[PDB]
Design a protein around this ligand. Structure first.
Ligand SMILES: *[C@@](O)(CNC(=O)[C@H](CC(C)C)c1cccc(-c2ccccc2)c1)CNS(=O)(=O)c1ccccn1
Length: 215
Protein backbone atom coordinates (compact mmCIF):
# COMPACT_ATOMS: atom_id res chain seq x y z
CA UNK A 1 0.00 0.00 0.00
CA UNK A 2 1.16 3.57 -0.63
CA UNK A 3 2.76 5.49 2.33
CA UNK A 4 -0.02 8.04 2.15
CA UNK A 5 -3.26 8.41 0.25
CA UNK A 6 -5.78 11.26 0.07
CA UNK A 7 -8.85 10.67 -2.09
CA UNK A 8 -9.77 14.35 -1.80
CA UNK A 9 -6.97 15.39 -4.12
CA UNK A 10 -8.13 12.50 -6.32
CA UNK A 11 -11.69 13.76 -6.71
CA UNK A 12 -13.36 10.95 -4.73
CA UNK A 13 -14.89 13.03 -1.96
CA UNK A 14 -17.98 15.30 -2.27
CA UNK A 15 -18.35 18.45 -0.08
CA UNK A 16 -18.64 18.19 3.73
CA UNK A 17 -22.30 18.06 4.73
CA UNK A 18 -24.20 18.70 7.92
CA UNK A 19 -26.47 16.15 9.46
CA UNK A 20 -28.15 18.69 11.64
CA UNK A 21 -30.47 17.28 14.40
CA UNK A 22 -31.24 13.92 12.83
CA UNK A 23 -29.16 10.93 13.89
CA UNK A 24 -28.14 10.24 10.29
CA UNK A 25 -24.34 10.03 10.70
CA UNK A 26 -24.47 6.41 9.53
CA UNK A 27 -26.30 7.66 6.40
CA UNK A 28 -23.62 10.20 5.68
CA UNK A 29 -20.89 7.57 6.30
CA UNK A 30 -22.66 5.18 3.86
CA UNK A 31 -23.32 7.77 1.21
CA UNK A 32 -19.73 8.96 1.31
CA UNK A 33 -18.36 5.39 0.78
CA UNK A 34 -20.88 5.03 -2.04
CA UNK A 35 -19.79 8.29 -3.72
CA UNK A 36 -16.13 7.18 -3.60
CA UNK A 37 -16.97 3.91 -5.33
CA UNK A 38 -19.22 5.64 -7.98
CA UNK A 39 -16.37 8.01 -8.90
CA UNK A 40 -14.00 5.10 -9.44
CA UNK A 41 -16.62 3.43 -11.62
CA UNK A 42 -17.98 6.19 -13.85
CA UNK A 43 -15.49 9.04 -13.40
CA UNK A 44 -18.24 11.34 -12.16
CA UNK A 45 -18.40 12.70 -8.59
CA UNK A 46 -22.06 12.85 -7.48
CA UNK A 47 -23.77 13.65 -4.19
CA UNK A 48 -25.91 10.61 -3.15
CA UNK A 49 -29.08 10.71 -0.98
CA UNK A 50 -28.71 10.13 2.81
CA UNK A 51 -32.42 11.00 3.09
CA UNK A 52 -33.16 8.04 0.81
CA UNK A 53 -31.42 5.86 3.40
CA UNK A 54 -32.98 7.47 6.50
CA UNK A 55 -36.57 7.09 5.05
CA UNK A 56 -36.15 3.71 3.45
CA UNK A 57 -33.67 1.42 5.31
CA UNK A 58 -36.38 -0.30 7.44
CA UNK A 59 -33.69 -2.36 9.13
CA UNK A 60 -32.33 0.86 10.57
CA UNK A 61 -33.80 3.51 12.90
CA UNK A 62 -34.08 6.59 10.66
CA UNK A 63 -33.01 9.62 12.63
CA UNK A 64 -32.58 7.35 15.61
CA UNK A 65 -29.55 5.67 14.08
CA UNK A 66 -28.46 2.65 12.17
CA UNK A 67 -25.72 0.59 10.66
CA UNK A 68 -23.74 1.18 7.50
CA UNK A 69 -23.83 -2.48 6.48
CA UNK A 70 -27.69 -2.32 6.56
CA UNK A 71 -27.66 0.69 4.24
CA UNK A 72 -25.30 -0.98 1.71
CA UNK A 73 -27.63 -3.97 1.96
CA UNK A 74 -30.75 -1.87 1.26
CA UNK A 75 -29.13 -0.30 -1.85
CA UNK A 76 -28.17 -3.80 -3.02
CA UNK A 77 -31.60 -5.37 -2.56
CA UNK A 78 -33.45 -2.26 -3.68
CA UNK A 79 -31.24 -2.11 -6.76
CA UNK A 80 -30.27 1.50 -6.26
CA UNK A 81 -30.15 4.79 -4.45
CA UNK A 82 -31.18 8.27 -5.56
CA UNK A 83 -29.02 11.35 -5.98
CA UNK A 84 -29.21 14.24 -3.48
CA UNK A 85 -30.91 16.28 -6.15
CA UNK A 86 -33.57 13.66 -6.73
CA UNK A 87 -34.07 13.02 -2.98
CA UNK A 88 -32.94 16.08 -1.01
CA UNK A 89 -32.05 15.92 2.68
CA UNK A 90 -34.57 17.31 5.09
CA UNK A 91 -33.11 16.20 8.43
CA UNK A 92 -36.13 14.50 9.77
CA UNK A 93 -38.06 11.27 9.28
CA UNK A 94 -40.51 11.03 6.39
CA UNK A 95 -41.94 8.15 4.41
CA UNK A 96 -39.87 6.41 1.72
CA UNK A 97 -40.01 8.42 -1.45
CA UNK A 98 -37.31 6.53 -3.33
CA UNK A 99 -37.78 7.28 -7.02
CA UNK A 100 -36.17 5.01 -9.60
CA UNK A 101 -35.87 7.58 -12.38
CA UNK A 102 -33.54 9.44 -10.04
CA UNK A 103 -31.33 6.37 -9.44
CA UNK A 104 -27.74 7.63 -9.22
CA UNK A 105 -26.00 4.36 -8.32
CA UNK A 106 -26.20 0.65 -7.34
CA UNK A 107 -24.40 -1.68 -4.87
CA UNK A 108 -23.40 -5.34 -5.22
CA UNK A 109 -22.86 -5.80 -1.50
CA UNK A 110 -20.26 -4.81 1.07
CA UNK A 111 -17.00 -6.02 2.67
CA UNK A 112 -16.08 -5.83 6.33
CA UNK A 113 -12.54 -4.95 7.41
CA UNK A 114 -11.23 -7.42 10.12
CA UNK A 115 -12.25 -5.95 13.48
CA UNK A 116 -9.49 -4.08 15.33
CA UNK A 117 -7.09 -4.46 12.38
CA UNK A 118 -5.66 -1.09 11.21
CA UNK A 119 -3.19 -2.44 8.61
CA UNK A 120 -6.19 -4.11 7.04
CA UNK A 121 -8.14 -0.86 7.06
CA UNK A 122 -5.10 0.79 5.41
CA UNK A 123 -4.94 -1.76 2.61
CA UNK A 124 -8.69 -1.34 2.22
CA UNK A 125 -8.46 2.45 1.84
CA UNK A 126 -5.36 2.11 -0.35
CA UNK A 127 -6.87 -0.43 -2.76
CA UNK A 128 -10.58 0.52 -2.55
CA UNK A 129 -10.97 4.23 -1.74
CA UNK A 130 -12.99 5.93 1.09
CA UNK A 131 -14.08 3.54 3.93
CA UNK A 132 -17.08 3.76 6.31
CA UNK A 133 -15.89 3.74 9.96
CA UNK A 134 -17.40 4.17 13.46
CA UNK A 135 -15.60 5.85 16.34
CA UNK A 136 -16.02 7.27 19.83
CA UNK A 137 -16.72 10.97 19.13
CA UNK A 138 -18.09 11.84 22.58
CA UNK A 139 -14.95 13.41 24.05
CA UNK A 140 -14.82 17.20 24.28
CA UNK A 141 -11.31 17.26 22.94
CA UNK A 142 -12.62 15.57 19.83
CA UNK A 143 -15.51 18.05 19.47
CA UNK A 144 -13.22 21.08 19.94
CA UNK A 145 -10.58 19.76 17.51
CA UNK A 146 -9.08 22.36 15.10
CA UNK A 147 -5.60 21.12 14.18
CA UNK A 148 -3.10 18.33 14.72
CA UNK A 149 -3.31 14.51 14.72
CA UNK A 150 -6.04 13.93 17.32
CA UNK A 151 -5.30 11.56 20.23
CA UNK A 152 -6.62 11.10 23.80
CA UNK A 153 -6.19 8.26 26.32
CA UNK A 154 -9.81 8.57 27.34
CA UNK A 155 -11.08 7.49 23.95
CA UNK A 156 -13.07 4.23 24.33
CA UNK A 157 -12.83 1.79 21.47
CA UNK A 158 -16.02 0.04 22.75
CA UNK A 159 -18.00 3.25 22.84
CA UNK A 160 -18.71 3.59 19.13
CA UNK A 161 -21.10 6.59 19.07
CA UNK A 162 -20.61 8.31 15.68
CA UNK A 163 -20.29 7.10 12.07
CA UNK A 164 -17.68 8.75 9.88
CA UNK A 165 -15.61 8.29 6.72
CA UNK A 166 -11.96 7.29 6.30
CA UNK A 167 -10.80 9.41 3.36
CA UNK A 168 -7.12 8.43 3.27
CA UNK A 169 -4.08 8.20 5.61
CA UNK A 170 -0.53 9.55 5.99
CA UNK A 171 1.79 11.41 8.39
CA UNK A 172 1.79 15.01 9.86
CA UNK A 173 5.01 15.53 11.83
CA UNK A 174 6.12 12.06 12.60
CA UNK A 175 2.51 11.34 13.59
CA UNK A 176 0.72 8.78 11.47
CA UNK A 177 -2.95 9.38 10.94
CA UNK A 178 -6.25 8.87 9.16
CA UNK A 179 -8.00 11.66 7.22
CA UNK A 180 -11.56 11.56 8.49
CA UNK A 181 -14.42 13.35 6.84
CA UNK A 182 -17.09 14.44 9.33
CA UNK A 183 -20.82 15.29 8.90
CA UNK A 184 -20.74 18.33 11.21
CA UNK A 185 -20.38 21.01 8.50
CA UNK A 186 -17.42 22.61 6.81
CA UNK A 187 -17.24 24.93 9.80
CA UNK A 188 -16.26 22.17 12.20
CA UNK A 189 -12.63 21.19 12.81
CA UNK A 190 -10.31 21.47 9.85
CA UNK A 191 -12.71 22.43 7.10
CA UNK A 192 -15.02 19.63 8.07
CA UNK A 193 -12.12 17.30 8.79
CA UNK A 194 -9.96 15.71 11.45
CA UNK A 195 -6.70 13.68 11.33
CA UNK A 196 -6.99 10.89 13.91
CA UNK A 197 -4.02 8.98 15.38
CA UNK A 198 -3.20 5.83 13.33
CA UNK A 199 -1.42 2.75 14.69
CA UNK A 200 -2.07 3.89 18.32
CA UNK A 201 -3.81 0.65 19.39
CA UNK A 202 -6.87 1.45 17.28
CA UNK A 203 -7.58 4.81 18.98
CA UNK A 204 -11.21 5.71 19.56
CA UNK A 205 -12.22 2.43 17.91
CA UNK A 206 -11.28 3.51 14.34
CA UNK A 207 -11.09 -0.15 13.04
CA UNK A 208 -13.84 -1.84 15.06
CA UNK A 209 -16.70 -1.20 12.64
CA UNK A 210 -15.23 -0.48 9.22
CA UNK A 211 -16.90 -1.64 5.94
CA UNK A 212 -17.11 -0.65 2.26
CA UNK A 213 -19.68 -1.27 -0.49
CA UNK A 214 -18.94 -3.23 -3.69
CA UNK A 215 -19.99 -1.40 -6.91
C1 LIG B 1 -25.23 9.41 14.42
O1 LIG B 1 -25.63 10.62 13.88
C2 LIG B 1 -26.43 8.48 14.69
N1 LIG B 1 -25.95 7.28 15.43
C3 LIG B 1 -25.98 5.97 14.96
O2 LIG B 1 -26.40 5.65 13.87
C4 LIG B 1 -25.41 4.85 15.94
C5 LIG B 1 -24.47 3.87 15.12
C6 LIG B 1 -23.15 4.34 14.39
C7 LIG B 1 -22.43 3.24 13.59
C8 LIG B 1 -22.06 4.89 15.33
C9 LIG B 1 -26.60 4.11 16.61
C10 LIG B 1 -27.22 4.55 17.82
C11 LIG B 1 -28.42 3.91 18.23
C12 LIG B 1 -28.99 2.87 17.43
C13 LIG B 1 -28.43 2.44 16.26
C14 LIG B 1 -29.18 1.45 15.46
C15 LIG B 1 -28.57 0.53 14.72
C16 LIG B 1 -29.24 -0.37 13.94
C17 LIG B 1 -30.58 -0.37 13.88
C18 LIG B 1 -31.23 0.55 14.62
C19 LIG B 1 -30.54 1.45 15.40
C20 LIG B 1 -27.23 3.06 15.86
C21 LIG B 1 -24.38 9.72 15.66
N2 LIG B 1 -23.46 10.83 15.56
S1 LIG B 1 -23.57 12.29 16.53
O3 LIG B 1 -25.00 12.50 16.73
O4 LIG B 1 -22.84 13.28 15.85
C22 LIG B 1 -22.83 11.95 17.95
C23 LIG B 1 -23.60 11.30 18.83
C24 LIG B 1 -23.01 10.91 20.03
C25 LIG B 1 -21.63 11.22 20.28
C26 LIG B 1 -20.93 11.92 19.24
N3 LIG B 1 -21.57 12.27 18.10
Amino acid sequence: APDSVDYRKKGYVTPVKNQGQCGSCWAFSSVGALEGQLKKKTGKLLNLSPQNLVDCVSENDGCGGGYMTNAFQYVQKNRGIDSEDAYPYVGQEESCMYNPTGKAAKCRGYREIPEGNEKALKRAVARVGPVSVAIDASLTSFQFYSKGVYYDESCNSDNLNHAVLAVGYGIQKGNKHWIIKNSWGENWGNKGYILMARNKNNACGIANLASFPKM
